[PDB]
C-alpha cells in the first residue's frame, strides 16, 4: 500500500 | 532473501496542454503489481499481477485515494519547483519519487527509502536514520528546512516501520508461488562465424526470475570481462528476464572457452561451452 | 541535460520462420520521459503494447514495447525510437542472433 507526502517541497 | 516493496511516482508538466500528468507503479522485487494514471477516465489503482486481484475492492479504493493525493501534491510541487529555480512557464519539467522498504531474512525492516529527483537530478532524500534529509542543492535546502521545521520525516517513519513492512509480508505470502519461487536460467551457447580470425561464442541466459544474474566467459580459467560484449538484462515480456555475453575467439579455439552462470535459482553454478 | 536511450530489439523466444512469437523493443536509460517507440514491419508501423512507465536508481526511464510476430525470410523488423537526446529517430533492425 502506497503513501503520499504530508506537504509539498 | 532480501525482498523489497517499491513505489515509483512520476509527474510531468505540459505547459499549454492542461495540468500535469501523474503516473505511479508499485513493485515487489522485480514484479510490477499496481499502476495508476491521472489521465485515465475515472482514474483508479489497477492490479497488474495475478496475486493482488485477491484483495477486497476497498484495498484498491485505498490506493486510489492515496494516488489522487500524490497527483494533487505534485501539481503544487511542479509549480513551487519552477519558482525555486526561477524557471519560465513554457518548459516541461519532471518530479520523480521512489519510496519503499527492504525486508531482510529476519523478517523485520532492513532499510527504508524515500527520495526525490527534479528533471532527473537528485533533489532530496531521507537518510537511513529516517530523521534527516540530504538536499542536492540550494532549492532543495528550502525544502529540507521546511520539512525539518514541520517534522514530516516522522510520517514517513510511521508508514515505513508500520504499513510498508506489513504489506510487503502480505504480498510475499499471497504471491508465494511467483515471488518466493526463483526460476533458473536455461543456458545455451551459440556460434556465429564472423571471419577467418574470429568466431563469436554467445552465451544466453533465458527465462530467469529474479533479474539479478552473473554471466561470464573464461578462457582456460581466465576471466574475459574486460574483452567481452555483455548486454543489459532485458524483460522477456512474460515476467522472466534475458541476458547474453559474447566473445570473439579464433576458430578451433572454441573449447578453451567456458561460460559461467550464477543465479539464486541454480542449486549449482552452470558451466557450459560450444556444443 | 537529456540522456539518450539505449535500445535492444529481440524476440521473447528463439525465432523460427513460421512460428508465432513476440517482438520486443526494450528502451532504457532515457530522460526526459517523453519518447516515441514504434515496432515496424518493412518500415510500416505495427500495433503495439507499451509497459507502464517506470525508472531506475539513477532516475532514467525504461519501457518495453511489444507485439505478436511471425518471423520469415521475407520480412524486416525494426524498432524506431525518437527522443529529445537524438537529432532524428533511430531505427534498430531485429536480428535473430541479438
From TrEMBL, chain B:
GO terms for biological process: antigen processing and presentation of endogenous peptide antigen via MHC class I via ER pathway, TAP-independent; antigen processing and presentation of endogenous peptide antigen via MHC class Ib; immune response; positive regulation of T cell mediated cytotoxicity. The keyword Acetylation does not apply. Residues 185-273 form the Ig-like domain. One of its GO terms (molecular function) is peptide antigen binding. Its main location: membrane. It is a single-pass type I membrane protein. The keyword Iron does not apply. Disulfide bonds join 101-164, 203-259. This is Ig-like domain-containing protein. It comes from Myotis lucifugus. The gene is LOC102433344. The chain holds residues 22 to 301 of 365 of the full protein.
From TrEMBL, chain C:
Residues 5-85 form the Ig-like domain. This is Beta-2-microglobulin. Transmembrane segments: none annotated. Coiled coil: none annotated. Disulfide bonds join 25-79. Belongs to the beta-2-microglobulin family. The chain holds residues 187 to 278 of 331 of the full protein. It comes from Pteropus alecto. It is found in: Secreted.
Amino acid at each position: 500500500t502506497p503513501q503520499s507526502a504530508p506537504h509539498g517541497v | 532473501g532480501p525482498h523489497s516493496l517499491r513505489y515509483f511516482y512520476t509527474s510531468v508538466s505540459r505547459p499549454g496542454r492542461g495540468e500535469p500528468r501523474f503516473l505511479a507503479v508499485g513493485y515487489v522485487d522485480d514484479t510490477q503489481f499496481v499502476r495508476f494514471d491521472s489521465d485515465a477516465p475515472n482514474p483508479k489503482a489497477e492490479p497488474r499481477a495475478p496475486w493482488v486481484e485477491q484483495e477486497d475492492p476497498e484495498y484498491f479504493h485505498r490506493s486510489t485515494r492515496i494516488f489522487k493525493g500524490a497527483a494533487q501534491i505534485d501539481r503544487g510541487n511542479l509549480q513551487t519547483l519552477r519558482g525555486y529555480y526561477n524557471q519560465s512557464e513554457d518548459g516541461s519539467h519532471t518530479i520523480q519519487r521512489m519510496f519503499g522498504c527492504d525486508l531482510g531474512p529476519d523478517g523485520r525492516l532492513l532499510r527504508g527509502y524515500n527520495q526525490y529527483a527534479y528533471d532527473g537530478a537528485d533533489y532530496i532524500a531521507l537518510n537511513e536514520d529516517l530523521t534527516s534529509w540530504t538536499a542536492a542543492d540550494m532549492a532543495a535546502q528550502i525544502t529540507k528546512r521546511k520539512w525539518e521545521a514541520a517534522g514530516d520525516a516522522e510520517h514517513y517513519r510511521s508508514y515505513l516501520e508500520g504499513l510498508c513492512v506489513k504489506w510487503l509480508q502480505i504480498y510475499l505470502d499471497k504471491g508465494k508461488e511467483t515471488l518466493q519461487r526463483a526460476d533458473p536460467p536455461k543456458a545455451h551457447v551459440t556460434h556465429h562465424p564472423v571471419s577467418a580470425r574470429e568466431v563469436t561464442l554467445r552465451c544466453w541466459a533465458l527465462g530467469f526470475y529474479p533479474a539479478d544474474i552473473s554471466l561470464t566467459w573464461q578462457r582456460d580459467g581466465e576471466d574475459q570481462t574486460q574483452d567481452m560484449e555483455l548486454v543489459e538484462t532485458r524483460p522477456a515480456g512474460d515476467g522472466t528476464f534475458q541476458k547474453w555475453a559474447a566473445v570473439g575467439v579464433p576458430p578451433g579455439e572454441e573449447q578453451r572457452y567456458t561460460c559461467h552462470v550464477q543465479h539464486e535459482g541454480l542449486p549449482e553454478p552452470l558451466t557450459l561451452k560450444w556444443e | 541535460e537529456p540522456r539518450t536511450p539505449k535500445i535492444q530489439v529481440y524476440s521473447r523466444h528463439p525465432a523460427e520462420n513460421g512460428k508465432p512469437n513476440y517482438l520486443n523493443c526494450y528502451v532504457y536509460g532515457f530522460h526526459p520521459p517523453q519518447i516515441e517507440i514504434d515496432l515496424l514491419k518493412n518500415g510500416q508501423k505495427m500495433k503495439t503494447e507499451q509497459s507502464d512507465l517506470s525508472f531506475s536508481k539513477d532516475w532514467s526511464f525504461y519501457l518495453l514495447v511489444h507485439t505478436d510476430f511471425t518471423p520469415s525470410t521475407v520480412d524486416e523488423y525494426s524498432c524506431r525510437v525518437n527522443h529529445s537526446s537524438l537529432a532524428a529517430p533511430h531505427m534498430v533492425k531485429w536480428d535473430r542472433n541479438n
